[PDB]
């Protein structure tokens, strides 16, 4: 509803920065509302859902096993690795790494998983192959969060990310087992509390993934709906703001409040 675009524009005014937005019907794939649908924004940690989708695709194809153990060392640890820093000597399974990357946004977990699938080049190939001709991953953690103005590396377009998320969660790309595992990891998301979840009515379902990067970059992708069942996908990105993390979070939450109000 345009009343939600009012809030998106309010966010641009408050943040002094571009905000990209998509509200997509999960069933039909129809875009219900949008703002800067085809402009590029850094994906920041939201790319981790796409990463684990590629991992699950390989599991479906018999090229990977969720229970396979990956060993790593201090040489592999990058900043903010809450889970991987505790398992240096135990190693972690593919399943444990995806859980850490998505639910805890563990950065080393993401890099380890990227290596298993062939790196940014292969994630990009996977995306192009499933119909997303614009989303691209070029670097690894932490450089992929640089958000240099006008840089197309490691970016997506709101409309593309929305339709890609719909395909991964409800399309035929992944098996039913893998589709469900991916959304379950997203429903257990532990670090997106100040965003859409803060405006979600009691009883509603939400499976999401948020991210933050340099130069004010922030983003969230989500499947949400009433009665504990998802029925729409929401994608929100912003980059360039000099505002505090709390201010960026408040603006995103307000957009969420409005789309819930006009559902
Ligand atoms: K556009």
Swiss-Prot record:
Protein residues bound to substrate: 209-211
Swiss-Prot/TrEMBL catalytic activity: a beta-lactam + H2O = a substituted beta-amino acid
Record's description of how this protein is used: This protein is used as a marker in many commonly used cloning vectors, such as pBR322 and the pUC series.
Any GO MF annotation of the entry: beta-lactamase activity
Effect the entry attributes to changing residue 212 to T: In TEM-5 and TEM-24
EC number(s) from the headed UniProt entry: 3.5.2.6
Keyword Transcription regulation: no
Active-site annotation: 45, 143
Enzyme class: hydrolase
Note: The beta-lactamase present on pBR322 was cloned from plasmid R1 (R7268). The class A beta-lactamase family has a specific amino-acid numbering system, sometimes called Ambler or ABL numbering and often misspelt as Amber. A multiple sequence alignment was used to derive a consensus sequence and then the consensus was numbered taking into account insertions and deletions. This allows use of identical numbers, e.g. for active site residues, despite differences in protein length. UniProt always uses natural numbering of residues, hence there appear to be differences in numbering between this entry and some papers.
Protein family: Belongs to the class-A beta-lactamase family.
Cited function: TEM-type are the most prevalent beta-lactamases in enterobacteria; they hydrolyze the beta-lactam bond in susceptible beta-lactam antibiotics, thus conferring resistance to penicillins and cephalosporins. TEM-3 and TEM-4 are capable of hydrolyzing cefotaxime and ceftazidime. TEM-5 is capable of hydrolyzing ceftazidime. TEM-6 is capable of hydrolyzing ceftazidime and aztreonam. TEM-8/CAZ-2, TEM-16/CAZ-7 and TEM-24/CAZ-6 are markedly active against ceftazidime. IRT-4 shows resistance to beta-lactamase inhibitors.
Xref: NCBIfam families: bla_class_A, blaTEM
Protein known as: Beta-lactamase TEM
